[PDB]
Amino acid sequence: SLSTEATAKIVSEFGRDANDTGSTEVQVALLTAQINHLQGHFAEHKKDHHSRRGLLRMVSQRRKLLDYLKRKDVARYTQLIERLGLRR
Template sequence: HIKDHGSRRGLLKLVGHRRRLLDYLKRNNLSKYTQLIGDLGLRK
């Protein structure tokens, strides 16, 4: 719903959390990162 800012905020928080975890993984274990990206179908 266009005016449901609470849900949008929660979703953005989750996405940001995922983003930070993936950034960490990319820095520390690149092979695992690329495998995970492929498995989840992220980052075209």
């Protein structure tokens, strides 16, 4: 679950072709917005351990994509964490 217009907001910024999501920079920006939308259910107390497993899965997906991106190109990594709140 993510707000209905919010996927297209990533295409309207990290995308470079209409309605396109093949970019790993779009995937990491979308996963970051999805993690933020899921932190709306947390940021308080640990009771939902099941929905927290899916949170750790998308946090691991972002970490697994960043490992692949750091192995691809260091500038494409550095310029992604320049537009997103990573290594704050």
